[PDB]
Paper text:
The Ca2+/calmodulin(CaM)-dependent protein kinase II ([name]) α isoform is a central mediator of synaptic plasticity that underlies learning, memory and cognition. A hallmark feature of [name] regulation is autophosphorylation at T286, which generates Ca2+/CaM-independent ‘autonomous’ kinase activity that persists even when the initial Ca2+-stimulus subsides. The principle domain sequence of a [name] subunit is illustrated in, with an N-terminal kinase domain, followed by a short regulatory domain that contains T286, the variable linker domain that is subject to alternative splicing, and the C-terminal hub domain.
A 3D EM density map was obtained at 20 Å resolution by using a combination of tilted-series tomographic imaging and 3D masking routines. The structured N-terminal kinase/regulatory domain, containing residues 13–300, was best fit computationally into each of the radial densities with the regulatory domain (red ribbon in Fig. 2a) oriented towards the central hub complex (cross-correlation=0.98 at 20 Å resolution). In this extended form of the holoenzyme, the CaM-binding sites (residues 294–314, red ribbon/coil) are solvent exposed and thus positioned for activation by the Ca2+/CaM-stimulus. Single particle analysis revealed a high degree of flexibility for kinase domain positioning, with almost none of the individual particles completely matching the average structure.
Residue numbers in the entry:
A (entry chain A), B (entry chain L): 0, 13 to 404, 407 to 472
Amino acid sequence: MYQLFEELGKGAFSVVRRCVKVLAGQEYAAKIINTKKLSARDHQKLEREARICRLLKHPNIVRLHDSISEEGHHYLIFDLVTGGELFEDIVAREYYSEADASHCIQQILEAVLHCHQMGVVHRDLKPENLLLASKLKGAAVKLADFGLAIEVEGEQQAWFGFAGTPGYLSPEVLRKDPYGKPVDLWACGVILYILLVGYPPFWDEDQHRLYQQIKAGAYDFPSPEWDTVTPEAKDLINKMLTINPSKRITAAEALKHPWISHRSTVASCMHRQETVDCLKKFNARRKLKGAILTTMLATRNFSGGKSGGNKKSDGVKESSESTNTTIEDEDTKVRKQEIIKVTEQLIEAISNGDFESYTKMCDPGMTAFEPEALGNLVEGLDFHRFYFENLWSSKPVHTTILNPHIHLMGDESACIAYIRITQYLDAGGIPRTAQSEETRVWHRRDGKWQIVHFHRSGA
Amino acid sequence: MYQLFEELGKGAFSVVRRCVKVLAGQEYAAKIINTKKLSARDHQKLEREARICRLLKHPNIVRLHDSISEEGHHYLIFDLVTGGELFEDIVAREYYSEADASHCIQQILEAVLHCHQMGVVHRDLKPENLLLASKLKGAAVKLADFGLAIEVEGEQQAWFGFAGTPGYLSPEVLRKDPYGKPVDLWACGVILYILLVGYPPFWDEDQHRLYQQIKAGAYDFPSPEWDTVTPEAKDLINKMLTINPSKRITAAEALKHPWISHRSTVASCMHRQETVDCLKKFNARRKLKGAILTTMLATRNFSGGKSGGNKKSDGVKESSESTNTTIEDEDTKVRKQEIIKVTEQLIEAISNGDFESYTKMCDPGMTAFEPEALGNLVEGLDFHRFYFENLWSSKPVHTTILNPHIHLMGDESACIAYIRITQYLDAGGIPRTAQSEETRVWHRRDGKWQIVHFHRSGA
């Protein structure tokens, strides 16, 4: 059904690759999950993932088009978004302000609101899920990958398991409390914070200490970098990083916060180069912490090409190697014989009165000096046509070429000079003979020798 | 004094590099020891290493030429041997028999005998110290690197320290007994054994167990591979791998052993492919042990393989239009003008009667059709010399070129045709005028346009 092309990204248990639907000619992202490496439970919960992703239809959420299981693999086929990570893109930009971070978070909150309204909680919101739609300027931010997402019943809270990514885990998940939609607003607070200053609010080498920090809500806004952040951006972060989920801002309420809904009078317009610089290091530390799959069993993409243009074959090499040095300077020249071939064909074409073959061997802008031109230079083949039509269209005539000399001037140019003697009969012969001295200038154009100019004397 | 070139090998505390003595023009191996990484004691014992290596003059031992200390480095400059390791070379050979291993061990024992006679014990004999003199067929085996070597007093034994390489350590060193020359004969037994079957006599993942094996002398000659080894090769190994150093064969006695001294009637001539195959893996395991710590100026990427792909670009370049406005729009390659230049210089050279400049612009084998040749084809410049000498060496004469046409036939070939009109005076002028139709065939040879053939009419 599909054809897999380049890899776009990875997880521990999946890769994502561009693919093309064979019969459609439409391109998609294939999430390829190695089901041999999953627990029975995580394999089974792929049914829930597939279902959640079909439900979700929103401009800031990548949607599922298809789901396929084979013996060792499951395939979840989504829309292709080609801009890569938001976070990578932010560091390559010429300007980045609070006003620009607000537009990022608004798009994320719109997506999250839509999830929550459909009874879906993402549970594992992090920078890796934040993709750009395309490489075009101002492409939309899009949520991608809901592999840890859950379905909830209205506003009911439950214990859905300990799942998430350490730095983005909510206090309630860490306290083992029943939970729901607010877990995603905590993670948005962590993302917003990183979007403003380029580093996370909670970090510790010791994971147990990290969790105590999260549960305590022990983040800060240190100078110098927070001194130029507006009080309203800090207020929104505070409202999201509220320890008690019943008191945490919802996605609907966050979207009405002035730093989002009154962005144009509230959010700062100042470029934050230090954020861009810190985010580079953040981005880099995220790409070292990882793992690699053992094997790479893959299919073969279409291969080959047709050759472009015409190339000369040339003389075949006599052997792979020999004692005698290759390319000796003094040797018999076949090339001169090639010129002799096209020249004999020329003389035969003139003798037979075949203007058709004479045209092929001559350049359309052929130059000519001949006694029939009375000392003038003639261009084209119109002039010799009068002799092809009238005279040569026919008593016995014998031509004789004497003392031919050939000058080879590269692969594509040559010149031959010789004496032509013609034996013929005039009226009631009386056999006659005539001499002329002829020069032909040959030039190979597109793999074919053509006369560019010729000179004749005494005829 | 010296110039360092490529690296040849390494240790933990030294690299070896080819170098050239600036004022000599002689090449050597420089052992470069980073003295900042040595203990005070090992730095000090470089004096002993330098001394031992000057003492030793033998055909199967690489000798020291010079010793230099700088602030962070010591340099021990030795003869360059270019064949690499014996062991690497054995696996690339077309044939390898007991008789060939006997020749290896004889050379090693000769070197060791010479050490022992000079009161030097190597202490760390191993495959890495066994180098070939050159890449020539039958190059000698040479001992290289005596960094753990000691000086002994006659036949006196002492405790010189625990030093060596685990697999080659003698029982007496492991028992902490005073020791001397026999430690090197134990290591030769281990080397001989590896030379015969391609694997070591003592091996264990657990170093403490390895040492108990060594101290017990618990090696064996298992079938199938030892079944075709002669009893005399096994006898020599047994004599060397004798636990009690007072009973171990000496280097002098080993050299008189029939498997060495009667090689031609005693040592088998049968190719041992299984030894060659095992030795490949042995060689590979020796080159990949992980270092305990890694220290370097740059991370370092290895260079090798091939350089395929990289197709060359076509290279055509567009010509910018002149910025000043032009009344008529024309744009031929300045190449046509180049032909016009050399042609005008030709006409001026003929007019001035300058045969010198005329010779340069003409090919030595120039072809010519002209009325002065009476319908014949003339080769060379001898024919026109008569006109340069006599006539042109001189009344007022004016030349006029009419209707020039140029055919460009590649970068190296061109052809120009034109009408030449000459105004002159005959006897007592009476101004006269003459017409001729001329064709020149130019060819660039070694960056210079030369006439290969020319044609003239009506002159």
